[PDB]
From Swiss-Prot, chains A, B:
KO phenotype (gene knockout): Embryos die around birth due to activation of Wnt signaling pathway. Embryos display a lack of lens formation due to Wnt activation. Conditional knockout mice lacking both Rnf43 and Znrf3 in intestine show a marked expansion of the proliferative compartment, resembling the effects of acute deletion of Apc.
Gene from which the chain derives: Znrf3
Extracellular side: 1-137
UniProt protein name: E3 ubiquitin-protein ligase ZNRF3
Role noted for this protein: E3 ubiquitin-protein ligase that acts as a negative regulator of the Wnt signaling pathway by mediating the ubiquitination and subsequent degradation of Wnt receptor complex components Frizzled and LRP6. Acts on both canonical and non-canonical Wnt signaling pathway. Acts as a tumor suppressor in the intestinal stem cell zone by inhibiting the Wnt signaling pathway, thereby restricting the size of the intestinal stem cell zone. Along with RSPO2 and RNF43, constitutes a master switch that governs limb specification.
Compartments it resides in: Cell membrane
Family membership noted in the UniProt record: Belongs to the ZNRF3 family.
Coiled-coil segments on the chain, per record: none
Domain of life, per lineage: Eukaryota
Subunit (UniProt): Interacts with LRP6, FZD4, FZD5, FZD6 and FZD8. Interacts with RSPO1; interaction promotes indirect interaction with LGR4 and membrane clearance of ZNRF3. Interacts with LMBR1L.
Length: 137, 137
């Protein structure tokens, strides 16, 4: 169940000597996707190997949306996403909705985050360009 | 100014437990760009945080090409590339033209390889399409 998420900044010194910085957050796996660990370069919402980070907004703003959260999940997997992380803060409904795709469940894991862990995540993304996530269990 | 390049493949297991495979490699940093070290996902020849990896073909095939090497180099950095690795194994003279950019050098490192290090890379990039690069010095 619990999905451990490491976010990893990387940064070089003029020397060549580099330094890497890492941040632990925790969210859950959606039964909508696999129970695998995974990793790639983060992307907020190609070539393969990337991690969608998707902030869900209130559905009041999006009464009937383009794609449902699942659709967005699956859409991501088919653009190469090695995994997908929704921030479900603004809409706790997505959890309930995410977890209705156990029948035809994606082959890449599908994690949501909320509250204090969601806010850590978002702060790192927005402040820095490069960034790779690991997602474990 | 020797570049130590490591290509790194991730491969989860059903358990959550996972495995990393790292293949070291050597190259050269061109004066056309920086003497930093960098990290990012690999792309052979939109995102921020990638390492382009360009094979250069025998320069008869392409007599007057769209872009030069250094024009390629700069296209990738313009499009986010955190570095660029050219494969010059089939076009040795690229080295010469890369290093005439050494009073305009690019923010991101520009690196090349050739011969056996070249193959290793190319071998790994194709056989699996989900690969990560750290580049040193």
């Amino acid at each position: 169940e619990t999905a451990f998420v490491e976010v990893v900044l990387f940064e070089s010194s003029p020397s060549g000597d580099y330094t890497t910085h890492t941040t632990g957050l925790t969210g859950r796996f959606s039964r909508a996707g696999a129970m695998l660990s995974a990793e790639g370069e983060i992307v907020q919402m190609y070539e393969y190997g990337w991690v969608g980070v998707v902030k869900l907004e209130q559905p009041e703003l999006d009464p009937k949306p383009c794609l449902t959260v699942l659709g967005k999940a699956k859409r991501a997997v088919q653009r190469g996403a090695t995994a997908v992380i929704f921030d479900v803060s603004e809409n706790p409904e997505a959890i309930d909705q995410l977890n209705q795709g156990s029948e035809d469940p994606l082959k890449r894991p599908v994690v949501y985050v909320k509250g204090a862990d969601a806010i850590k995540l978002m702060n790192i993304v927005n402040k820095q360009k490069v960034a790779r996530a690991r997602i474990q269990h």
